[PDB]
Every structure is written in structure tokens, then in C-alpha cells.
Design a protein around this ligand. Sequence first.
Ligand SMILES: Cc1cc2c(cc1C)N(C[C@H](O)[C@H](O)[C@H](O)COP(=O)(O)OP(=O)(O)OC[C@H]1O[C@@H](n3cnc4c(N)ncnc43)[C@H](O)[C@@H]1O)c1[nH]c(=O)[nH]c(=O)c1N2
Ligand SMILES: Cc1cc2c(cc1C)N(C[C@H](O)[C@H](O)[C@H](O)COP(=O)(O)OP(=O)(O)OC[C@H]1O[C@@H](n3cnc4c(N)ncnc43)[C@H](O)[C@@H]1O)c1[nH]c(=O)[nH]c(=O)c1N2
Ligand SMILES: O=S(=O)(O)CCS
Ligand SMILES: O=S(=O)(O)CCS
Ligand SMILES: [Mg+2]
Ligand SMILES: [Mg+2]
Lengths: 489, 518
Amino acid sequence: WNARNDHLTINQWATRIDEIGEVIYNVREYDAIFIGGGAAGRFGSAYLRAMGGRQLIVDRWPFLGGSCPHNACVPHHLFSDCAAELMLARTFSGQYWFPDMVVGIKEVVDLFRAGRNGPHGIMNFQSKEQLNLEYILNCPAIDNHTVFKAKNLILAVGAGPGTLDVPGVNAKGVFDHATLVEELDYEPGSTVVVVGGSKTAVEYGCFFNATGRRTVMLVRTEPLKLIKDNETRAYVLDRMKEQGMEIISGSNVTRIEEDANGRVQAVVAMTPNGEMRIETDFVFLGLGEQPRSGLDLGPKGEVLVNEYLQTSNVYAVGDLIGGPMEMFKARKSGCYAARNVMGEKISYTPKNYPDFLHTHYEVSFLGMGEEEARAAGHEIVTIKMPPDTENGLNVALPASDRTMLYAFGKGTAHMSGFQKIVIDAKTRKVLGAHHVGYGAKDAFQYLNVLIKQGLTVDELGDMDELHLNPTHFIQLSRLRAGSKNLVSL
Amino acid sequence: VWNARNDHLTINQWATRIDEILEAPDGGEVIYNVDENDPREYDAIFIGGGAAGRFGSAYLRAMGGRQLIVDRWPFLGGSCPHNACVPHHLFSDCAAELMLARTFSGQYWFPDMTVVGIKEVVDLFRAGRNGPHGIMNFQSKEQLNLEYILNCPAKVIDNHTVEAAGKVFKAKNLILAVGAGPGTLDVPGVNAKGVFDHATLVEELDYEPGSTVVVVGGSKTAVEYGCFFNATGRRTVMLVRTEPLKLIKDNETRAYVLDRMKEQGMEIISGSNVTRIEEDANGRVQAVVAMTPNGEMRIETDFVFLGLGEQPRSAELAKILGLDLGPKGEVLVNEYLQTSVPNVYAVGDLIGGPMEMFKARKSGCYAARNVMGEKISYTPKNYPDFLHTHYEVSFLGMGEEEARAAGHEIVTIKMPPDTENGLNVALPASDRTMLYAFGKGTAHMSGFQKIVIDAKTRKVLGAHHVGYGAKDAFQYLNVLIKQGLTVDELGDMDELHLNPTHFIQLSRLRAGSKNLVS
Ligand SMILES: Cc1cc2c(cc1C)N(C[C@H](O)[C@H](O)[C@H](O)COP(=O)(O)OP(=O)(O)OC[C@H]1O[C@@H](n3cnc4c(N)ncnc43)[C@H](O)[C@@H]1O)c1[nH]c(=O)[nH]c(=O)c1N2
Ligand SMILES: Cc1cc2c(cc1C)N(C[C@H](O)[C@H](O)[C@H](O)COP(=O)(O)OP(=O)(O)OC[C@H]1O[C@@H](n3cnc4c(N)ncnc43)[C@H](O)[C@@H]1O)c1[nH]c(=O)[nH]c(=O)c1N2
Ligand SMILES: O=S(=O)(O)CCS
Ligand SMILES: O=S(=O)(O)CCS
Ligand SMILES: [Mg+2]
Ligand SMILES: [Mg+2]
């Protein structure tokens, strides 16, 4: 279908994408052909075009934007929203406007499926009409100059879900993030088994638990290693366990038992305390994504690239080059490859970036944890909420938007959140920041920039805080910055 | 007088004790926390231990000076925990959650919403407000090493002399931090039962309001409380004296906010002045009569909320000290927070607008630094700002029309885009707007945001956001913008997708061009 001279609206695009199928054909020599039009390929194309170069995107999906809108970040955020709202409803069940509190997993997945063509339509419309891009969609993509001829290739095919080499892994009722939003044709029973212990497993597991299902996470090593501050990690894990989640470390699935109809009936796992069998008809695999890869490859199948994103005229970007598999990495690697193709030699080594994951809370972190900073030899002070006292977490701070009910409810104050900054006592520089609650994720983007510039506790204290703020760092810093001899709070 | 100096109560013990003192029929004991073994003179006595006095004391003590806080409240922190910022946020949380529940009424886990008790939420606040009070007393004494006398009005004798708890204290300076009182209306029936302000709402609500609420004013307070009252299921009429939400300078952002308020059922009346509050034979409000641009209006109601500007508490102190006052009763100060009276500073809401926590705390600290010999000026402006409706509304810098009127060639980067589909598209979207983004016919509710950029310098001139989870970000973003942030530098940050503000990645989408395009 030649839609080059066809100007459809966002919602007309959404409809056409749902309908599709025919190849969507929207077409100087090409400076680069992008193999894949996800975050890396789409942003790389946008930047290359904006620089005045010629680009072509070829993707097997009939929409641009890749996994993010179809089965990754967007559905994850919808599920995390549900997890947080459901924790609130269950905590205040039968109080105020809250009714007596099992949420239908399939209805939420079906809501996502019914609405995901909105973002698809925005992607196709914005890419064609506003970003001036050429693309061929709903078509899978010869040599380092041939696909169409181009001066360079930029490989941006992403990564695929990790698999498990155990009997029963293909049983009906085993899902990953990709298949959950394509093949869920029943409502899961009362138990969920989640395999894995990092972001995807924890985010989806907290959603399943929030729907009212007994949720058992089988973690190969130790959960949430990305949270380096020990107290922050312990708060996050403690709140997950209080919600009823069961986290079993050092455990490996031995087999997924199939019933006579081919459906999951149980998971058998080895743990440090021996073998256990969990009855379930629903298993979610939250394992690491695997790059879709004469290129030199790394140990995990990632395509090897130098600091200019060049492989062994062929660049590679995004999840295809391995961790960190985040949207900032995919989009920046795509743009930087495009700039190098267009003659602007610029290196990219992702380092000292902010990070985040969802449980029933938003969990934001950057820089050093407290113990990590001390083990590196720093005199450190910490400024945190709640304070270290005999009352512990059972006090009405920290408190901000979407945490006030916890702060004021009977016996719920410990759920109002946790946060901390780690400060070098000699330089007065902020070395790390950590937050559990809501509404700080966005701030950590900009805070990390200030910290990379050399932010001190005095400079933090001298800012204008928008009370009551998700992060209390500004004013709590101001309470201590008047002393040349810094003291923790 | 309770000599508390050598008692070391926990946070929760403080919460209980403050509750007891606040409920004592005889007013309760004076809380006396003075280091009677320290021979040093007081560098400053703070009249008031709210945000300004408490932070000023903390900073002065941290610098090595001696301070003495004297407040009439049995707790530190002032209006913020007791009847201002804290209860406000509690109510705004409720307003946002209730808009969500009403939008998805009878779907997923949500109950059928086709009237929430205002009194039970206020009672919840009253039952839990001692927690913050306890932390304030505990942090101030055990962590910040502050001296204070609470549950005792201060009696200023002169510019170096103050009486408290039957004793006279001398100080090198006074720092006045008594704040402001609720604004009132000079109309017949204003003292009727059923007429409340932010202070009286959390102390005197002994009944559950009826189906209609009349809010007087267009302040942040008026809009914040109004949205909460509307969200409980009540017809809510706002009587704005001038034009609503003038603080939102960007016309597009303001229009989005107002449109969403009206979609929730709020009636916003501009150019309006209450002429009388009608009382029934029981002494309770039965109606509000107001002059509007469309003539006289009479609204039947048994519940009126006044959200007028706060009035600096300057009268007594100006008589005793001879302080120069401004037209609204604010205490006049130079840029070092010095009043007209030697060795007397004034801070916080007492010095007038802007009446914000950052202003109160920073003015307290800068006064303290000047007292301690560090000449430092404080003139607040180019600060970020926010308010609640059923959404969080965040803004800094220039609106689009304001930037053009100031002579800038500008481009804008916004979500949703200007297309035939308008707001009815699934962006912007992030935490706490995903249901709106995906729901049947609710996409327009997923928010609105815009940055304003100078087309020549590429500098970001202003930022505006309606949604959730960007308020905290605007604190740090404003600093970066005051440093001279360009669209290129913004594009080069690390975003945390899906982000409340999409500014980073959308900037990156346009930053590749020499000639910027919206
Ligand atoms: C469940 C879950 C949740 C999240 C995340 C991942 C997952 C699995 N991520 C990570 C994020 O999704 C990831 O980093 C980016 O989507 C990677 O973008 P790429 O463009 O590299 O791959 P991506 O997979 O997006 O794009 C690859 C594209 O190439 C196409 N393709 C593949 N093979 C092809 C062929 N042979 N021919 C043509 N086309 C082909 C595919 O169709 C696809 O469109 C994330 N990150 C984040 O920052 N925040 C978050 O909240 C989350 N959340
Ligand atoms: C309803 C509402 C909602 C909000 C806000 C205000 C209001 C009214 N504010 C503004 C904020 O509350 C205000 O700017 C600060 O609390 C001002 O702090 P001060 O210390 O100046 O006065 P504050 O009023 O807090 O303190 C004055 C203290 O002096 C004491 N005092 C008075 N007379 C005395 C006497 N004779 N002797 C001894 N002590 C005496 C009082 O007891 C009181 O403790 C706000 N700001 C913001 O930044 N974000 C927000 O969300 C909100 N929300
Ligand atoms: O990064 S992309 O804009 O392509 C997809 C966002 S869901
Ligand atoms: O600013 S204070 O910490 O004094 C009160 C906050 S509610
Ligand atoms: Mg707490
Ligand atoms: Mg929208």
C-alpha cells in the first residue's frame, strides 16, 4: 500500500493498524537504512533526518515504536498504575469511597489490547507527518550496503524474551511479557508463579499480587540487586512481603507440570531448603531479554560495538547491543549512531544514569548507596526520611502526593515511603539519591544532571522546594547545610 | 510550666502529648525547652515557630548561634501541619483518587459512584495531624538542638526583650515569624454557622454538608478545596473576584485546566463578589447572594468555604515596635529582611506574598544568616509554582503568549499535538494517567504539557504540565533553566520512560535541526 501521498490522522492510523496484511510503503542515496523501527531505529531516523540526511526504516510490525507501545514499557506502566491503585484500595478497603476488597487480569490485559493502537497511531502519524521520515512497515527486512542501497546500516532489531530449558515451558498458561498481551484467553486461578527477580518480574508480579492472587517469585540469585542502598532495598522488599508476596532466593524451576489437557497445573522448583511444588495454572517468566543477533558477538549474544556504535558501515544500537536495556539507551544510541553516520564523530558510553523500577511503589535511584559509599572510603552523612528512631517507619513522614492517606491512616504510616541522600562530608557533594513512593521518578532525571555537575548540600538547600514535595531533599539539606561540620538527619 | 529540657520523648510520645495538651480544658501546660546551663546571649528570638521560625532557628543554630523559639502552638511547624499545606495535600489526594473512581465507576475494581463524607475526611486529618506535630517537636529538640517555648504566646517588650512562660529573655535581635491569618469577607451573614475557612474547617466541622458547596475566591486554596468538595459529589460553585487561575500564565495550559474542572461539574463564576450570606432561623447558612457579570445570583447551600488571601499578623507587633507596614498590613522589610526597627527582622507570611513554604523557610534562614554576620539578600522571583485541581498543575517561566509579547521568536514542544483529533489521543501518558490514556473516551484526560523555547538562542523559556508526578521535577528543572538550559542540553539527558514530563525525548526529536520546529 503506497501511503506516501496519504495523510491519515492519528485515529485513522490507529484504525488502519488494527485492521492490518498489506505492506505499508512510505518512500539522494540513503545515508542509513535502519533494520527495525523501535525506540532506537525511530529516534535515530528522526535525528538523522533532522540533520538533513536520508533514512529508511524497515520493520516487521505495521507500526513504529517497537516493543515499548506493543508489549513492553506502556503495558508495564498500565499494570503498575493498577498495582499502586489496588494496594491503596486494599489498604483502605471498606473505608471512605473504597468498597470491600479478585481483579480480572484478562480484563486489564484486554483494556491494553483494545487501546494500544492509540500509541501506534501516534507513532505512525508523528513519524510521517511531523518527523518527515520514510518507512516500510509490516514487512521483515543482503550485505553491508544492501537490504535498497544505503551508505550505512544501523541494526536496531532489539531483543527477545528469555527462555527456560525445563519440561512444560510450552504448556498453556506459561507467559512472558510479549505473549501475555497476545495469548491470554482465560482468567488465571488464585496462584501465580513468577520466575526471575529483576525489573520485569517484580513489576508484573506486584500487579498479579495486587489483583488478589497468591504470588510466588522464584529468584535464581537475590531479588532487586539493582537497588544498591541496603535500607532502600529492605524497605522495598519489606513492603512487597507485607502485601503477601513470597520471594524465594536461590531457587531454580525444575519442571512445569502439565495436566492432561496440556495446561499448567504446578511448578516444581529446587530451593536452598529443598524441592517444593506450587499448584498454579499461570506462570509468568520475567527473565532477561536476549539480543536478536559476520558480526562479532559478546558472551550473551549482544552485537559488539565500539564507543561510536560501530560493529566489526554497520552500526548497532538499542537492546541489540546489550545492557542497559532502557529507553534512554536505545534512543540515545540510535541518535548517536545517526550523528556518526552523518559525519559527527561522538562517543557514547552510558554511565552514571538514574534508574527506576515499580513494585506497588515507584522506586528511583541514582549514584551510590550508603554502605557502598563508606566501603569506598568516604566520610558520609545521610539525610533521610523517616529518621532512625525507636518508632522506626511508624511515623507520618515522608509524605507527599498519593501517600497522604498512608501517612494519616490508622496503622498505615510505615507505608508512606522511604528516601535518602548520601553526601560526602568533606566535599559536601551529593553522591547518591534514593526514593520509594510516588512522583519522584521524573525529578531524578533532572536531579541526576545537577549531581553530575557537582551538586552540594548547600546548593540543594538553596533551591525553591514545591512543598509538600515527593523528594524532601531540598529542605532537609537546608536544615543541615548551615554547619561547616555536616551531621546526618 | 513543664520543664521538658531533660525529657527525651519519642516522635509518637510527642504526638500523644501534644494531642493531650491541645485537648486540655485549661489550655494545657507550657512546653519549656530552654538550656538553662548555657551562658551565651541569644543571637535571636523567633516570634513564631512555623516554617520560617523553625527553619531560621535550625540554620542559626547550625551556624553556631543561639536561638529561642516562642510559639503559642503546643507544636512546631506552624500552619503547615495543622491547617494548611498538610490537610490541603490530603484533600487533593482525595480529589485525584475520586476523579479516577468516578471516571471508571463500576469498571475493574472500582465501585459504582453514580456522595463522599467531607466530615469523615476532615476527621481523618484531625485524627492523624498529631504525627507530623510529634516529628516537628522531636526533630527540633533532639536532632536540630533547638531551644523553644511552646503553648505560650510571646509578649514582645522591646526590640531586644521578650517575655515567655513568666520569664524575660534578652536577645541581640528579634525575628518576627507570626505568619498570616485567614482572609475574611465584610458582608452580612459571614459569621453564620456553615461558613468556613482553611483554619475553621479542621476545627469546627460538626455536621456533614449538603448537596451544594459555595467557594469564595480564586486562590490556590479556593481551587484546591473546591476540587475536593466537587470530587465528593457536590455541586460546587466558585465565586472568583477577578478571572480564574490567573497564575497559569500560559493560555493553553490554563484553558486545559479550566475545561477539565468544568467537565467534572464545577461552575466557575468570574468577576463575582458576595453581597450577603443568608442565615436560616437556626443560624445556619441557607444561601449565598453575589453580584456577577450576569447580574445577581443566589445559590442555596448550607456550606460556604472562604478561600481568600491570608492577612499578615502585624497589628500587635507594629504597635509595640513601631514597625512600618505596607498597604495589606504586611511588615515592610529591605532585601536583608530587616524591618524599619533596628535589630528586628521579619520573615515568612508576615512579610506578604509570595506566601509559600520555600519563601517562609528561605526568608527565615537568610534573616538568621544576616543576624550571624553574613550579609545576604533575599528577593524571591523566577521560582517554580504549582497548584492542585483534580490534577497537579506545574509551571515555571514564561507562557507562550507572554514569551512572544516579550519579543521572543519561539517554538513550542507539547503533548498532545495540535491535530484534528485534539486531546483524544493516548498521549501524554505516564504514572497515574495510564487508565485515562487507555480508557474508552477518557484519553483527553491524560494530561497536557508544553515547553516554550527561544527559536534563536534555543533556550528553554518556560515549562508547563498538567497531570501527575512532575511537581517534584519542576524544582530541579527550574534550577537547570535558570542556568541557561537549551533544547539540545535537555535532549541529551537520560529520561526515565514513561516519564511524567516528556520534555527530554521530545526535545531530542527536534534538537537535530539548525532551524527548530514545534
Ligand atoms: C516488559 C518490559 C518493560 C520495560 C522494558 C522492557 C520490557 C521487556 N524496557 C526496555 C525497553 O523496552 C527497551 O530498552 C527498548 O524497547 C529497546 O528498543 P529497541 O529499539 O532497541 O528495541 P525494540 O524491541 O523496541 O525494537 C526492535 C524492532 O525491530 C523489529 N525487528 C526485529 N527483527 C526484525 C527483522 N528481521 N526485520 C524487520 N524488523 C525487525 C521489531 O519489529 C521491533 O519493532 C523499559 N525501558 C524503559 O526505559 N522503561 C521502562 O519502563 C521499560 N519497561
Ligand atoms: C490552606 C493553605 C494551603 C497551603 C498554604 C497556606 C494555606 C493557608 N501554603 C502557604 C504556607 O502554609 C505558608 O506560606 C507558610 O506556612 C508560612 O509559614 P510562616 O512561618 O510564615 O507562618 P505560619 O503561619 O506557619 O507560622 C506562624 C506561627 O506563629 C505563631 N504565632 C502567631 N502569633 C503568635 C504569638 N503572639 N506568639 C507566639 N507565636 C505566635 C503561630 O502559632 C504559628 O505557629 C502553602 N505553601 C506551600 O508552599 N505549599 C502548599 O501546598 C501550601 N498550601
Ligand atoms: O521511543 S518511541 O517513541 O519510539 C516509543 C514510545 S512508547
Ligand atoms: O516547614 S516545617 O518543617 O517547619 C513544617 C512542615 S509541615
Ligand atoms: Mg512513614
Ligand atoms: Mg491525551
